[PDB]
Amino acid sequence: TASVLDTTLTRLIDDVIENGSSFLQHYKQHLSHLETASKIALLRECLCVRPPLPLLPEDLLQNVDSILTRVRQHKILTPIFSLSPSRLIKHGDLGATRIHLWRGDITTLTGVTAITNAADNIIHAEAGPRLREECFQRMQARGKELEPGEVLVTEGHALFASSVMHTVGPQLKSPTETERRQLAKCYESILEALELLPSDEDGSKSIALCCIAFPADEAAEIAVSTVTSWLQKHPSTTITDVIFNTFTQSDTEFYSKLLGPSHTKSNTPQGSLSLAREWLSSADAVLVTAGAGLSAAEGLDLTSLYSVFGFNDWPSEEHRWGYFFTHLNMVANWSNTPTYQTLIPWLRNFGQDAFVRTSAADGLFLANGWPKEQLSTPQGSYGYLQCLNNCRVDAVVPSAPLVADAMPHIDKATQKLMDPSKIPLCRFCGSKMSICVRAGSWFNQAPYQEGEAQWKAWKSRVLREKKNLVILELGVGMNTPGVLRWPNEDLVMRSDGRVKLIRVGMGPEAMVPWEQEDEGLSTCVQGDIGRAIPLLLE
Template sequence: MSTLSAALAGKALDHALQSLWIESKRRFGQPIPCHDCGRVHNDEQHLGELTSDPSFLLDLEIHRKLTLLKELLTVRYPQPMGDELLNNVELALKHYNSLQPLTQARSLPVINVDDPILGRLALWKGDITTLSATAIVNAANSALLGCFRPQHPCIDNAIHSVAGPRLRLRCAEIVDSLPDGEADTGGCLVTLGYLLPAEYVLHTVGPIVSDDQPNEEQKQDLQSCYRACLEEAEKLQSINTQGKTVAFCCISTGMFGYPPALAVPVAVSTVIGYFEAHPNSTIAKVIFNVFSSSDYDLYLDHFRSLTKNAQLSLPIPKPYYAPLEKAISLICSADALLIFGGAGLSASCGLDYTSHRLFSTHFAATALRTGARSLYELFGYQFPTQRDKWGYYFSHLSFASSWPLHNPPAYDNLKELVSYFDDEDLFVRTSNADGLFRRHGFDVNHLSTPQGDYTWLQCVESCTEDSVFPMQPFLDVARPYLDTSEQTLSSDDAIPKCPKCQGDMFMCVRADSSFNDVRFREGERRFTKFLLSCRERKRNLVVLEIGAGWNTPSVLRWVSESLVEDKVAKLVRVGLKGSEMVSWSLEDAVGVECDANGVIEQLLKAKRDVTMGNV
């Protein structure tokens, strides 16, 4: 989508969001039946307190705007929208959908190309709402109206969220026409896909299993779901002349309780039986779509058994992902590169400060004593004594400074990527204090760490401007008394004291207002000089921002956006769960939702190919 279209979509999003907010305010307190539990909740529980003035919505981050738009649509009853509101909602959703990966159903490899039936079956792990197919199957409930619980992870919610509000309106019309006012278990009802890449949606209601062992009737109901969907798919008129493609989600195996291990053979045998009975079917391919690795393994093991091929594996086709293509184009055309490294970059290498598993594995004793669940939670924590404090922090520093390098190779690949730029045309600025850029061999003369660095300790009171000291000598003194497995310090003599005033010390990181940045000002001066040099030399500067979330947006996110707004640079933002998103009004900026390792690897490959003349 063009920059102009993106800007229009951004305006449409703002208008739609304000209109839906006002609409929700007018019906505040109206009961909303919960799709999950059947009880009645109200808007306040789902959406927070509604204010009368919606103008504050305009200042929200783009990710929060989209999340709130979808929440408001999720709890909205199927009532007609005015043309203007509907157009604004759909324009915003269309643009958002265009930024998602797109997989062509016809590109998915079949189980056995030489078999007349297994040559029609495929297995794919991915988001069914990003699959371009004739039809996708929705595991609906009998009300058929979708999920009314915002951000609920069910397939029903996912499909309605992408398809847009016309899907719920159409489903309501269908339900109103049914004799009992609800859909039967084991049947299939058809709607258009609307904003989905699939042409149609096949809605089926699976059996609900209350224990671990479905009875014969429930098994037959599940079989009926698959048969009914295939029968309805036969009747569809498709724009694809190469044959119809139908993707099944895992019916009934979620909240409806059908054990996945028992559902897989039912699903596969029913589809095989259908093709055996209909050898001239107009359906060219049936895809068993899964979202979890465990479900994928169940299907793969089943197909290995059917084919008597224990080594069966299925190649994963590369989806078309427009943001990644744009990112590659920007990086390959750049003649100057500025890397902004956030916490997500180190997290992609395992050093994740928000990870509960990492913390409970390596700092179990501290977790038990403090109740903390992650490394991040302990910044600013008030330990009972200085020995408790430094027992933890010296263990933390030892842990971070010995974090294994090179696997995965995100930093190594990033280092190779910057090697394609002259020294005067590259710079790294990071909010991370863990030293991984330095430890991976990045030139410290082209590196700024404005949030501090674990290799320094400082006087808490900053008794003098330069009361910042190398950390290692203090750690060496403490080691004989330090138990890193318990995160304890056995002697007061090991507690670090400021060499100048004998006062308390802390890591030299921006954890509070006492942070002393004296050791990091030179890096910031070099950063400013780099930007001025790029501007004076009219370099085509691209900011590659990786893993910068919202904890300290003024350090990386807002700076990179300002550089784009001021026409100083272009921006490639890499992140997860919405942190990758850029304002739709920004020209020459793109957000790529992907793990840092994968994106860096693909950017490096593209840069290599361009440099070697392979493209």
């Protein structure tokens, strides 16, 4: 057998033929040698352009549902029972309903009886095709359309939630009293429906409400006041938790004002994160491979730092270096580095059995205290300048002293260097200089050769001492996958289970090879590196 992903994908391509739409052939055969992430994107495309027309058969829907679920478990997951309330509605001595505020992706809440949907995109992608077919049937069978304030209940299918509440709010162009009342009816309709649904097996019952072009401050207070009174007036309610789920920071603020501070917490992690944590705690050695995504998580951010290496319309060399010196300075003094400040002390517990190899050397490893003897930078770094004609191997120089000596002489409004004697020129051919990073055929890799030698010696020793090596790959994109990503996959493949890979990043390039995940050798954590790292390493 091929994998479940390969099997399922070929039947959906096949379905797109025999009775498909027209929105070709080759992918079906070469599939087995295509990249996992690419194939999941194709599978999701096949489903998005599915004519709902002939029902997919049961066994195929089961496979689709398994895949969506397995992929969604790579996200950082939040169980309902981990949240902390901002308000408690006390039901005499009968019990209580907790009211929470939570910013995030509603499909990544776990242990949640019901979630809400307006009228679409994320919930349908994640629930799978069964949701479209149940909404279609239930809408036909009721015959009428949804009025503002009404709700349609479906199963959650491939979602972690048991049920979905699909509701229509009012629409405006200035909110009238009828529209205020329509929005409140939505919340009431949701809670009344939810009262009648079964509980989870532990007796809890929970709903995540999304924000339902209505003024956000007023919508938010109708939501909180409506839910609050309804719970006050239903002391016998079987409802135990209501989550106001915001996405934007402004909504979270509107809601936080109305609701108040979060209560005091009174581990049990989940998803690929728990597995990654196991691996990290059993490791005898750790390699960190990092790309630009790690520093982007700290606030330093399609482009290949176009400003420095691409942009080529400088009014003069004084402007060019004024900008370059200001940039090197700002990076060198970056004050917000909490992810580095958590990762580095954790790596130090490994002594000589930890190593850092980075393709986007902005210098933040060294500046948060990682030693250069356990560091590699094969695409170069901001630590050096070089001759732009690359006239000889020695035509490089440390950048830091030149940055420092130049900064007092740069007009901050125009970023113009006001002393031309500070323009760096090749001390041998006198040509222009650049930052010594791979950004063109002129790159000189000679100042990083010692780093390369340290990496070869370290790998060699760690692999031969048969150690349980974990590769934590942080924020590596897809521009040059041969530098870190493919060699990491390779070590995993060659090393007979002694090497495992945890890839962490945002977006779908965070995925690892399906077959290595199946063997328990590789997993990934898709989300913000700044969020994942404290969770992996606590």
